[PDB]
Design a protein around this ligand. Structure first.
Ligand SMILES: Cc1cn([C@H]2C[C@H](O)[C@@H](COP(=O)(O)OP(=O)(O)OP(=O)(O)O)O2)c(=O)nc1N
Ligand SMILES: Cc1cn([C@H]2C[C@H](O)[C@@H](COP(=O)(O)OP(=O)(O)OP(=O)(O)O)O2)c(=O)nc1N
Ligand SMILES: Cc1cn([C@H]2C[C@H](O)[C@@H](COP(=O)(O)OP(=O)(O)OP(=O)(O)O)O2)c(=O)nc1N
Ligand SMILES: Cc1cn([C@H]2C[C@H](O)[C@@H](COP(=O)(O)OP(=O)(O)OP(=O)(O)O)O2)c(=O)nc1N
Ligand SMILES: [Zn+2]
Ligand SMILES: [Zn+2]
Ligand SMILES: [Zn+2]
Ligand SMILES: [Zn+2]
Ligand SMILES: [Zn+2]
Ligand SMILES: [Zn+2]
Ligand SMILES: [Zn+2]
Ligand SMILES: [Zn+2]
Lengths: 393, 393, 393, 393
């Protein structure tokens, strides 16, 4: 199966963070050592870069920041003062909108001057997708737990609606307007063909992938996470789409599983996510530092249990708990969103970590295979469980 | 244009080093910080790993070693004692041949035990190529300086002959024999489909690309490097194929240029390359640490000279001289093999470095473009020049 | 006594290297870990940056390069590819002269783009001197070995001549021309007062200091280094001025001593210095990592020999031998230039290091103090000795 | 079997280097990353510390220096300036003898002041030996190749003579004189019992071990290394005793083998060893980073050849070649001294490395075991071989 690249995952996650349920709004991904240490959105008061500065401080040193829009000079100067390594941005309308003009152009010139005289690398890191990536993402999104749960109890129409909305929000349809934007933000190298068309095609492909994944967990009828108070359905859907996006980083050859841990703080913060802050993220993969042939990839079809992948694969929840950027606070409400039902070795870890709520698909609940089982999730106590289903009331 | 990956380049270079013009012969590539610091071949006395130990010593610390065959236990224990990081090997018949049996199997078990109890990672790092990579390599090999030079004064017949020879040398045609080899060398994870077939297909694709590149500089009629004593035509062809392989790592979007610097020592050496030892290697690329859109990629067609790639591209010879692993010794004969004619900014650098001989294609000699010229190569003095041509004697 | 800063030392040394006795000529200082690892001059064929690339390779990683003129785009791209940290340059007419124009301006724009899209920091690092630095340098230059030796057997006339010549060579007298140069090389921040006048005044002060030091070892009458073949008097004077510039970095509170070790290669080199290459440099100082009050600074006047600085001061020749960037080759001629007579502690070290020649001051020869003596220099065997004096023939 | 400590190995090697066949003479061991990178002796002109400074320069950074006597202030200041990490010394009469005295005491005070104000750690690092270490060393020294070779064609008499001589040279028999020395060199903490007696007993035990090892290669009758010109018998015996001392660092459970590679330079150097300089050293051990139970330790008695130590043990010559601090110069004469006969996997490595001469014991010549053989040493060509034997002429 095709795999999403790291920089493309971070770009997609920043674009999705810009859409978090609440000068243009900006989403931001803070990555350290190829691990996500922050997910931020602009608020009505502060920009995403200012929020990242407040939240991290000097911990931004040697960090990679993926913005959904080019940050303003006020944000960029503080970000490079904090000592970040890379600032990747989505080459659309920047934070100070250029589609509104003299102040925005002056801000863009100031950003260029800051970039020219800093060790931080301000750039565009989005890469082309493989030709099969979008088709594979669509195939797996139609076969995901939530779409199938809806089907048993439409998806293409929701996908088309999300395509239109996200193309409006994230792309510049007019080619001359986009050329002007790229000239203003110091991307003149991508203003002439084939680089201009290639950049626009890559952006359109990433937007199509994002719309596909977002439609995999759709706002459809009365479908949401139900069955200790649940989150608003919009935030739950957004976090589940984060997990679904992470599921496409899978090292597994058959099934990708993603997990995101968020927490709800007691006091209101400066972030555009409100009291909620990102805690951890993960996908199913082999132990870090493993080659392609280091560990078996065979499924249960293998006639030898020793050469089955199950005893060596790190699960999405296990990876989210391992590489968490925050501590699970016992007083705070904490949520883990996982694309598949948690297994019998993940549920005890989630419970022991103190995670209060599990939002999950329940397609595999109650299944007992030779190597992996799902009996503990159904009988789990002390952790609220929310599954995709019709609103029972 | 498609780009060869680093690990695939190193695997191909080790396989090609096994074919250097003079228990099975082994080629070896020693890489440090993603830069080639050694190119070795087994001799009649010493294996490639023992030769690498003699040549480097403690400098093998944190190095990646790419072997054309799985090294024996005697080689592996010393290599891991020296402190290397990775030992990638080509999963054909190992150094101690398993196609000859009890001693070879015991050696394989000892190698596995060494691998299990060492920090060094022994693995197979060859990865699938792009579906267009082989076709693109064939297209550029037919359009290379040497094939065109022969054409003006056949290539596919040589390609087929090299395909047969290199498939015989580097592949195991019998599937059961290859399965036994992989079981013995501790690669049981790749002994069942689709992993077995995928591994064999990747190996066949790499062998096809290697045969294509080797045929791009063919042993055809009386064509060789001519026009202070020249190297034997076999060694010159081998080094030119090394440069051609490096040319496929190009960061440029149109033309890939490769360069290899070798030197001929005075006293006898332990290597299978004889007195000749690898000095440096390079390809045309942008300055290290540059993103895709950091520097212009436009050719001379651009209406603005400021946005042309020529003032920012590092040439193959410049990269070979920058990241050389050895010092150019004034007393020793030193050779640089470059796929294209050296330009007017590369010839002075080659002359100043003290390189005695330039083996090059002369298709572009005498051309004077706006940004790049070739006038200094024809009028160069103090450096022997050898070009692809019929033997003038 | 006032002390020269490291960055001003390197700037002065690069400007002086531009004047090494043999597009504008460029001098270059390569510094690693605040230690000089290279002294280069442009040749007829190659620029200083290209020469540094040939000489060092990837060893330029994390190095600071001090250029007497702003390097061209061809030099800058290679230097950045090599991985240097800082490129300080003297903000006069750059390497591609702007006083000759479209090609030079295009090269300057390319240099600006390379600087803006690289991790390397291209900058002007010259800083103001203390108000007493020039007066103190003049006072010590009149009271140095090479001026007092002539006086016993004029200095201000030579100083005025050097002032005129070096102001003509290194400064841009016309303010509009200098403003145009600074605008072209991307130094617009220094084109407006008081920054323009401050930059010009700092440059004038540095040029005055350089002229003072250069005239402290003057081309006067038939005075030179005499008493196994001697170097040309011009090169000997240039190296002595190098050592004299180093003497102003002294940690001593009374007397500054400088030492430069150069070596003559057997074969032809690409550098503008010819076969001669820089080996090491040093000044008298306390052991590295010592504070102001770590060690005693009292001279022999102290009534206790324990609290005398002599037991703890590292001499200039000892520092030059300690932090040498090259190995002393027994076959090659090697010279050490020391501003004062080498002591009985340094002469055995110089002899043991294999240094063939000592060019030294003659004032302190034969002095025998309680802590430091000079008896071994006169009776030294196996090392050629050249002192400042009238030509005996 | 008991194992010699690293620090005790270095202390013994410094004491033995003080006895290298040519103010008191001082031996010096320079160690980097627990590997010996230099073996030096004081000459008639330069002290061991000054020689180490000349030979290494800034390469002494973070190095551990083991002195046979406490270095003088002139040596210590330069060694600290070079950036060494640790200076261990033998707490006998220091470099400036205190048994001759006001100048010596002043030098000791200056050394103490240098130690107090430097990051370098000046200390006495000799450790007590286990109670069986000396008895085991005596047992293995009587059963070594050279003593047995003499016996087949006395050892305790030579042992007693060496005990007397080395106790005279390295120990201070008078307790009051040693107390005065320790007070003067700032070791007052070890001047009163039991620390004074414990220090003296540890020193006596180390000198007994040194005398034992030295007597195991005795100046007896006309026995020397014979069978392209051989080294003087004194230097050959000294290097063989170095190898014997290294043999006691063995990770093997049965037999310890040591190897030292030295080279003779073409030109005279500053060292007290003359033109000869240390190249490398090694002992038989498992690959670096292995635990006690990582690899099998069984001899040939084990039935399963897979669990035999022979396929995983790194030999003494292999370790000497791996961690060499110098390159083998083809023009220079190079010698390797091995306590045992080189095996069939060591002789090809020695020959390929370009080592001109092998000085070794010949007890095992011609033995062919299942895992280790000695057939190649007898038929070795192109390498001079010198074995312990009565002088044939
Ligand atoms: C339950 C769970 C699993 N994983 C991982 C384990 C596998 O690496 C992959 C699924 O792969 P799997 O075990 O073959 O499951 P399938 O659906 O393909 O099985 P099937 O339909 O044949 O019954 O996700 C995870 O990261 N986090 C979880 N909470
Ligand atoms: C001469 C030379 C060049 N290079 C690089 C520079 C460019 O990055 C690329 C060619 O790129 P180019 O100049 O656009 O292409 P051509 O020349 O084929 O031009 P054409 O005839 O189609 O107009 O190789 C190199 O690494 N080492 C060399 N010695
Ligand atoms: C000989 C010599 C010395 N030095 C240093 C160490 C001295 O500590 C300092 C001068 O310091 P100094 O000795 O108090 O000064 P003077 O001798 O001028 O004293 P004077 O004759 O007026 O009483 O240079 C040096 O780096 N290289 C040398 N080859
Ligand atoms: C020949 C040789 C060996 N070694 C090491 C590896 C062996 O593993 C160990 C002795 O271990 P060994 O082989 O069990 O011992 P012996 O031979 O004494 O056996 P014996 O005749 O009593 O049965 O030295 C070495 O470092 N350098 C050498 N050149
Ligand atoms: Zn902002
Ligand atoms: Zn799980
Ligand atoms: Zn081998
Ligand atoms: Zn070129
Ligand atoms: Zn230049
Ligand atoms: Zn001195
Ligand atoms: Zn000393
Ligand atoms: Zn051996």
């Amino acid at each position: 199966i095709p795999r999403l690249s790291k920089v493309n995952l971070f770009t997609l996650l920043s674009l999705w963070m810009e859409l978090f349920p609440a000068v243009k709004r900006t989403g931001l991904v803070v990555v350290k050592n190829m691990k996500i240490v922050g997910l931020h959105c602009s608020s009505e008061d502060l920009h995403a870069g200012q929020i990242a500065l407040i939240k991290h401080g000097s911990r931004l040193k040697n960090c990679d920041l993926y913005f959904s829009r080019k940050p303003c000079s006020a944000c960029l100067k503080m970000i490079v003062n904090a000592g970040v390594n890379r600032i990747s941005y989505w080459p659309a309308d920047p934070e100070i909108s250029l589609l509104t003009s003299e102040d925005a152009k002056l801000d863009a010139k100031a950003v260029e001057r800051l970039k020219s005289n800093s060790r931080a690398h301000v750039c565009v890191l989005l890469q082309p997708l493989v030709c099969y990536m979008v088709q594979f993402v669509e195939e797996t999104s139609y076969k995901c737990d939530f779409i199938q749960k809806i089907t048993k109890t439409f998806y293409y129409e929701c996908k088309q609606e999300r395509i239109k909305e996200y193309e409006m929000l994230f792309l510049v349809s007019n080619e001359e307007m986009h050329k002007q934007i790229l000239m203003t933000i110091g991307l003149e190298n991508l203003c002439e063909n084939p680089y201009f068309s290639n950049l626009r095609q890559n952006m359109k492909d990433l937007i199509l992938l994002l719309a596909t994944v977002a439609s995999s967990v759709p706002n459809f009828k009365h479908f949401g996470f139900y069955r200790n108070q649940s989150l608003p359905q919009e935030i739950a859907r957004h976090c589940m789409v984060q997990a679904r996006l992470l599921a496409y980083r899978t090292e597994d050859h058959k099934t990708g599983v993603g997990a995101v841990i968020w927490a709800e703080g007691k006091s209101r913060s400066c972030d555009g996510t409100g009291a909620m802050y990102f805690v951890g993220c993960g996908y199913n993969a082999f132990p870090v530092g493993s080659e392609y042939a280091d560990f078996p990839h065979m499924d249960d079809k293998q006639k030898d249990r020793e050469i089955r992948k199950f005893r060596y694969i790190i699960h999405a929840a296990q990876n989210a708990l391992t590489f968490r950027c925050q501590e699970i606070k016992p007083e705070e409400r904490s949520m883990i969103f996982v694309t598949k039902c948690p297994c019998d070795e993940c549920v005890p870890l989630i419970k022991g970590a103190g995670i209060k709520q599990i939002y999950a698909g329940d397609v595999d609940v109650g299944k007992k295979k030779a190597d992996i089982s799902y009996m503990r999730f159904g009988e789990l106590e002390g952790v609220s469980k929310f599954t995709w289903q019709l609103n029972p009331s």
